[PDB]
Amino acid sequence: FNVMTKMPGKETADRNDPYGETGFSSIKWYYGILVKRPERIAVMKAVAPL
Amino acid sequence: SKLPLLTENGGRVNRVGFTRLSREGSIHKFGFFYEFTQESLDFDSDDQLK
């Protein structure tokens, strides 16, 4: 996980928000899969009671 | 009514601009004279007319 925080202050000022009040915190990540032997994964579907 | 009032959502609010004026002043030329003749300072009643 990559977490990028920019606390309100000098690091959030811009010509759009000259006072610098709003910050944020963003978490971005990569994920993938490589099914090599799908013959070994087995599923089974059925309904369930209330 | 016109007081600068901020909110939490600090943004493009309360913009102020300034002006710069100028003041001038000129220069003018004056002068005068008078004429006399040698026949008015040679035989004249006073010795120190000039």
Tab-separated table of N, CA and C in Angstrom:
chain	number	residue	atom	x	y	z
A	1	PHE	N	0.825	-1.197	0.000
A	1	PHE	CA	0.000	0.000	0.000
A	1	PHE	C	0.864	1.253	0.000
A	2	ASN	N	0.478	2.225	-0.822
A	2	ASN	CA	1.108	3.540	-0.850
A	2	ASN	C	0.116	4.541	-0.274
A	3	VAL	N	0.521	5.238	0.784
A	3	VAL	CA	-0.320	6.215	1.462
A	3	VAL	C	0.348	7.577	1.357
A	4	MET	N	-0.354	8.535	0.757
A	4	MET	CA	0.160	9.887	0.557
A	4	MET	C	-0.742	10.853	1.318
A	5	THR	N	-0.216	11.423	2.395
A	5	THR	CA	-0.940	12.388	3.209
A	5	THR	C	-0.341	13.772	3.007
A	6	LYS	N	-1.204	14.773	2.869
A	6	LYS	CA	-0.787	16.167	2.740
A	6	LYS	C	-1.592	16.971	3.755
A	7	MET	N	-1.033	17.122	4.949
A	7	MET	CA	-1.745	17.786	6.027
A	7	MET	C	-1.985	19.250	5.665
A	8	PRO	N	-3.135	19.813	6.029
A	8	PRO	CA	-3.402	21.219	5.705
A	8	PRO	C	-2.337	22.144	6.270
A	9	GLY	N	-1.929	23.110	5.454
A	9	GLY	CA	-0.898	24.055	5.827
A	9	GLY	C	-0.283	24.712	4.611
A	10	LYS	N	1.047	24.762	4.564
A	10	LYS	CA	1.725	25.315	3.400
A	10	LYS	C	1.687	24.367	2.210
A	11	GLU	N	1.476	23.074	2.450
A	11	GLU	CA	1.555	22.066	1.403
A	11	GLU	C	0.246	21.877	0.647
A	12	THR	N	-0.820	22.582	1.024
A	12	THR	CA	-2.080	22.495	0.303
A	12	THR	C	-2.523	23.823	-0.292
A	13	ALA	N	-1.710	24.868	-0.188
A	13	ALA	CA	-2.066	26.166	-0.741
A	13	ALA	C	-1.898	26.167	-2.253
A	14	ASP	N	-2.780	26.890	-2.930
A	14	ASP	CA	-2.719	27.047	-4.376
A	14	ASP	C	-3.544	28.268	-4.743
A	15	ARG	N	-3.503	28.630	-6.025
A	15	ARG	CA	-4.317	29.748	-6.483
A	15	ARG	C	-5.803	29.448	-6.379
A	16	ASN	N	-6.175	28.178	-6.218
A	16	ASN	CA	-7.567	27.802	-6.008
A	16	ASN	C	-7.975	27.871	-4.544
A	17	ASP	N	-7.074	27.510	-3.632
A	17	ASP	CA	-7.295	27.631	-2.191
A	17	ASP	C	-6.075	28.340	-1.617
A	18	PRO	N	-6.062	29.674	-1.652
A	18	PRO	CA	-4.896	30.409	-1.141
A	18	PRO	C	-4.688	30.269	0.353
A	19	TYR	N	-5.717	29.907	1.115
A	19	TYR	CA	-5.583	29.846	2.564
A	19	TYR	C	-5.054	28.507	3.054
A	20	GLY	N	-5.191	27.449	2.262
A	20	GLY	CA	-4.624	26.165	2.624
A	20	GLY	C	-5.304	25.500	3.804
A	21	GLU	N	-6.551	25.068	3.620
A	21	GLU	CA	-7.320	24.469	4.700
A	21	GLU	C	-7.645	22.995	4.510
A	22	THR	N	-7.739	22.509	3.279
A	22	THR	CA	-8.190	21.153	3.009
A	22	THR	C	-7.001	20.258	2.696
A	23	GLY	N	-6.878	19.164	3.443
A	23	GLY	CA	-5.891	18.143	3.152
A	23	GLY	C	-6.560	16.862	2.705
A	24	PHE	N	-5.798	15.783	2.558
A	24	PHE	CA	-6.372	14.515	2.127
A	24	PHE	C	-5.451	13.380	2.562
A	25	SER	N	-5.835	12.156	2.205
A	25	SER	CA	-5.039	10.964	2.457
A	25	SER	C	-5.461	9.862	1.495
A	26	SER	N	-4.594	9.512	0.553
A	26	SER	CA	-4.941	8.595	-0.525
A	26	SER	C	-4.140	7.311	-0.396
A	27	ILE	N	-4.833	6.168	-0.494
A	27	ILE	CA	-4.154	4.835	-0.426
A	27	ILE	C	-4.323	4.124	-1.780
A	28	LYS	N	-3.227	3.907	-2.514
A	28	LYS	CA	-3.303	3.267	-3.852
A	28	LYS	C	-2.491	1.967	-3.840
A	29	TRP	N	-2.944	0.945	-4.574
A	29	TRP	CA	-2.250	-0.366	-4.546
A	29	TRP	C	-2.482	-1.174	-5.821
A	30	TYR	N	-1.543	-2.061	-6.155
A	30	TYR	CA	-1.640	-2.935	-7.316
A	30	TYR	C	-2.011	-4.339	-6.866
A	31	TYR	N	-2.769	-5.043	-7.703
A	31	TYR	CA	-3.155	-6.416	-7.421
A	31	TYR	C	-3.341	-7.173	-8.727
A	32	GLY	N	-2.949	-8.448	-8.713
A	32	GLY	CA	-3.087	-9.305	-9.872
A	32	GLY	C	-3.147	-10.758	-9.455
A	33	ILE	N	-3.335	-11.623	-10.447
A	33	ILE	CA	-3.455	-13.057	-10.206
A	33	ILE	C	-2.932	-13.801	-11.425
A	34	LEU	N	-2.441	-15.012	-11.197
A	34	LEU	CA	-1.962	-15.895	-12.254
A	34	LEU	C	-2.445	-17.309	-11.949
A	35	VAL	N	-3.622	-17.658	-12.463
A	35	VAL	CA	-4.147	-19.002	-12.262
A	35	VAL	C	-3.381	-19.966	-13.162
A	36	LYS	N	-2.561	-20.817	-12.547
A	36	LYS	CA	-1.707	-21.721	-13.304
A	36	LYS	C	-2.383	-23.054	-13.579
A	37	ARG	N	-3.089	-23.597	-12.592
A	37	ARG	CA	-3.797	-24.867	-12.717
A	37	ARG	C	-5.244	-24.649	-12.296
A	38	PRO	N	-6.073	-24.078	-13.176
A	38	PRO	CA	-7.501	-23.933	-12.861
A	38	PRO	C	-8.207	-25.258	-12.669
A	39	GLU	N	-7.565	-26.361	-13.037
A	39	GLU	CA	-8.077	-27.691	-12.766
A	39	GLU	C	-8.187	-27.988	-11.279
A	40	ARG	N	-7.456	-27.260	-10.436
A	40	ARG	CA	-7.436	-27.536	-9.007
A	40	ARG	C	-8.419	-26.687	-8.217
A	41	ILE	N	-8.823	-25.534	-8.739
A	41	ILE	CA	-9.858	-24.735	-8.095
A	41	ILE	C	-11.212	-25.308	-8.486
A	42	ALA	N	-12.018	-25.656	-7.490
A	42	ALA	CA	-13.356	-26.180	-7.719
A	42	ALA	C	-14.365	-25.364	-6.926
A	43	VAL	N	-15.484	-25.042	-7.566
A	43	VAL	CA	-16.560	-24.292	-6.939
A	43	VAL	C	-17.809	-25.162	-6.944
A	44	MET	N	-18.791	-24.762	-6.140
A	44	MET	CA	-20.063	-25.477	-6.081
A	44	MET	C	-21.141	-24.486	-5.668
A	45	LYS	N	-22.169	-24.347	-6.496
A	45	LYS	CA	-23.207	-23.351	-6.275
A	45	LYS	C	-24.499	-24.014	-5.816
A	46	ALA	N	-25.116	-23.444	-4.783
A	46	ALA	CA	-26.410	-23.906	-4.303
A	46	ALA	C	-27.062	-22.788	-3.505
A	47	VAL	N	-28.393	-22.844	-3.399
A	47	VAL	CA	-29.101	-21.851	-2.601
A	47	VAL	C	-28.929	-22.156	-1.118
A	48	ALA	N	-29.279	-21.181	-0.292
A	48	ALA	CA	-29.141	-21.266	1.152
A	48	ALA	C	-30.466	-20.932	1.814
A	49	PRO	N	-30.732	-21.494	2.990
A	49	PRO	CA	-31.984	-21.187	3.688
A	49	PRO	C	-31.950	-19.803	4.314
A	50	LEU	N	-33.135	-19.277	4.605
A	50	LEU	CA	-33.275	-17.938	5.171
A	50	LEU	C	-32.490	-17.783	6.467
B	1	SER	N	-21.328	44.357	6.661
B	1	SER	CA	-21.647	43.705	5.394
B	1	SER	C	-20.387	43.298	4.635
B	2	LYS	N	-19.391	44.178	4.572
B	2	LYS	CA	-18.213	43.957	3.740
B	2	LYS	C	-17.056	43.299	4.479
B	3	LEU	N	-17.255	42.864	5.717
B	3	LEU	CA	-16.169	42.280	6.486
B	3	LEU	C	-15.649	41.021	5.793
B	4	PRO	N	-14.333	40.837	5.696
B	4	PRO	CA	-13.805	39.576	5.155
B	4	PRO	C	-14.076	38.433	6.117
B	5	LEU	N	-14.899	37.486	5.677
B	5	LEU	CA	-15.343	36.393	6.535
B	5	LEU	C	-15.012	35.071	5.865
B	6	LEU	N	-14.189	34.266	6.524
B	6	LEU	CA	-13.783	32.967	6.015
B	6	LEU	C	-14.654	31.862	6.593
B	7	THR	N	-14.693	30.748	5.879
B	7	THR	CA	-15.329	29.527	6.342
B	7	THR	C	-14.277	28.428	6.429
B	8	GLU	N	-14.717	27.246	6.857
B	8	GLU	CA	-13.818	26.099	6.899
B	8	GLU	C	-13.334	25.734	5.505
B	9	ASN	N	-14.231	25.776	4.523
B	9	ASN	CA	-13.890	25.451	3.147
B	9	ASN	C	-13.132	26.605	2.513
B	10	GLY	N	-11.949	26.914	3.039
B	10	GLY	CA	-11.167	28.025	2.539
B	10	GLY	C	-10.908	27.923	1.054
B	11	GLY	N	-11.260	28.968	0.316
B	11	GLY	CA	-11.100	28.964	-1.122
B	11	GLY	C	-10.907	30.352	-1.684
B	12	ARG	N	-11.273	30.543	-2.950
B	12	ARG	CA	-11.120	31.837	-3.607
B	12	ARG	C	-12.223	32.769	-3.110
B	13	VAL	N	-11.957	33.397	-1.969
B	13	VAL	CA	-12.886	34.335	-1.355
B	13	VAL	C	-12.098	35.528	-0.833
B	14	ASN	N	-12.749	36.693	-0.836
B	14	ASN	CA	-12.168	37.928	-0.325
B	14	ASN	C	-10.881	38.295	-1.052
B	15	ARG	N	-10.965	38.573	-2.346
B	15	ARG	CA	-9.819	39.045	-3.108
B	15	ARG	C	-9.774	40.566	-3.070
B	16	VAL	N	-8.571	41.111	-2.911
B	16	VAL	CA	-8.361	42.549	-2.822
B	16	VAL	C	-7.234	42.935	-3.762
B	17	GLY	N	-7.355	44.100	-4.388
B	17	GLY	CA	-6.312	44.628	-5.243
B	17	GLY	C	-6.017	46.075	-4.896
B	18	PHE	N	-4.809	46.513	-5.235
B	18	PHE	CA	-4.312	47.828	-4.867
B	18	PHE	C	-4.014	48.642	-6.118
B	19	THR	N	-4.067	49.964	-5.972
B	19	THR	CA	-3.836	50.886	-7.070
B	19	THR	C	-2.718	51.852	-6.710
B	20	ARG	N	-2.063	52.383	-7.738
B	20	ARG	CA	-0.922	53.279	-7.584
B	20	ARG	C	-1.106	54.460	-8.527
B	21	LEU	N	-1.214	55.661	-7.963
B	21	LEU	CA	-1.433	56.868	-8.744
B	21	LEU	C	-0.119	57.634	-8.894
B	22	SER	N	-0.178	58.817	-9.504
B	22	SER	CA	1.018	59.611	-9.745
B	22	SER	C	0.667	61.088	-9.686
B	23	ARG	N	1.651	61.898	-9.298
B	23	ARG	CA	1.497	63.342	-9.178
B	23	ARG	C	2.628	64.017	-9.940
B	24	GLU	N	2.288	65.014	-10.752
B	24	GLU	CA	3.251	65.670	-11.618
B	24	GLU	C	3.562	67.080	-11.125
B	25	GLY	N	4.389	67.779	-11.897
B	25	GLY	CA	4.743	69.161	-11.639
B	25	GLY	C	5.714	69.668	-12.684
B	26	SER	N	5.461	70.856	-13.225
B	26	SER	CA	6.176	71.335	-14.395
B	26	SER	C	7.233	72.369	-14.011
B	27	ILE	N	7.839	72.966	-15.034
B	27	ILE	CA	8.833	74.023	-14.887
B	27	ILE	C	8.502	75.120	-15.891
B	28	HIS	N	8.503	76.369	-15.431
B	28	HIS	CA	8.161	77.508	-16.270
B	28	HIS	C	9.259	78.561	-16.211
B	29	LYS	N	9.339	79.367	-17.266
B	29	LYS	CA	10.373	80.384	-17.407
B	29	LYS	C	9.758	81.778	-17.361
B	30	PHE	N	10.403	82.676	-16.618
B	30	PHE	CA	9.966	84.057	-16.455
B	30	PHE	C	11.079	84.985	-16.939
B	31	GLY	N	10.899	86.278	-16.728
B	31	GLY	CA	11.949	87.247	-16.988
B	31	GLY	C	11.429	88.597	-17.453
B	32	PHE	N	12.250	89.629	-17.246
B	32	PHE	CA	11.959	90.978	-17.713
B	32	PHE	C	13.261	91.765	-17.787
B	33	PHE	N	13.186	92.956	-18.384
B	33	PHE	CA	14.362	93.805	-18.550
B	33	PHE	C	13.923	95.262	-18.627
B	34	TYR	N	14.894	96.134	-18.893
B	34	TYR	CA	14.666	97.556	-19.106
B	34	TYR	C	15.842	98.101	-19.901
B	35	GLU	N	15.606	99.150	-20.680
B	35	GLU	CA	16.641	99.721	-21.530
B	35	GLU	C	16.959	101.151	-21.114
B	36	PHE	N	18.215	101.543	-21.308
B	36	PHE	CA	18.666	102.902	-21.063
B	36	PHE	C	19.658	103.305	-22.143
B	37	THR	N	19.855	104.607	-22.285
B	37	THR	CA	20.800	105.153	-23.246
B	37	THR	C	21.970	105.801	-22.520
B	38	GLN	N	23.124	105.825	-23.191
B	38	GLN	CA	24.296	106.476	-22.615
B	38	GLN	C	24.024	107.948	-22.343
B	39	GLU	N	23.166	108.564	-23.145
B	39	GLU	CA	22.720	109.928	-22.893
B	39	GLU	C	21.769	110.022	-21.717
B	40	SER	N	21.439	108.900	-21.077
B	40	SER	CA	20.622	108.905	-19.874
B	40	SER	C	21.396	108.542	-18.621
B	41	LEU	N	22.637	108.077	-18.746
B	41	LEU	CA	23.492	107.804	-17.604
B	41	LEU	C	24.762	108.638	-17.613
B	42	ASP	N	25.006	109.417	-18.666
B	42	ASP	CA	26.199	110.247	-18.722
B	42	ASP	C	25.906	111.629	-18.160
B	43	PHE	N	24.965	112.352	-18.770
B	43	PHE	CA	24.504	113.622	-18.206
B	43	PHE	C	23.101	113.424	-17.638
B	44	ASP	N	23.068	112.956	-16.394
B	44	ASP	CA	21.838	112.769	-15.644
B	44	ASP	C	22.079	113.267	-14.226
B	45	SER	N	21.006	113.668	-13.545
B	45	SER	CA	21.148	114.318	-12.244
B	45	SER	C	21.898	113.435	-11.255
B	46	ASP	N	21.549	112.155	-11.194
B	46	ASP	CA	22.141	111.253	-10.220
B	46	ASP	C	23.352	110.538	-10.799
B	47	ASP	N	24.324	110.271	-9.931
B	47	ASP	CA	25.562	109.603	-10.300
B	47	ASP	C	25.421	108.087	-10.279
B	48	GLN	N	24.558	107.546	-9.416
B	48	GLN	CA	24.461	106.103	-9.236
B	48	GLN	C	23.098	105.575	-9.659
B	49	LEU	N	22.592	106.033	-10.803
B	49	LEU	CA	21.301	105.554	-11.290
B	49	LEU	C	21.327	104.048	-11.520
B	50	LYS	N	22.426	103.546	-12.082
B	50	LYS	CA	22.550	102.143	-12.454
B	50	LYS	C	22.432	101.205	-11.260
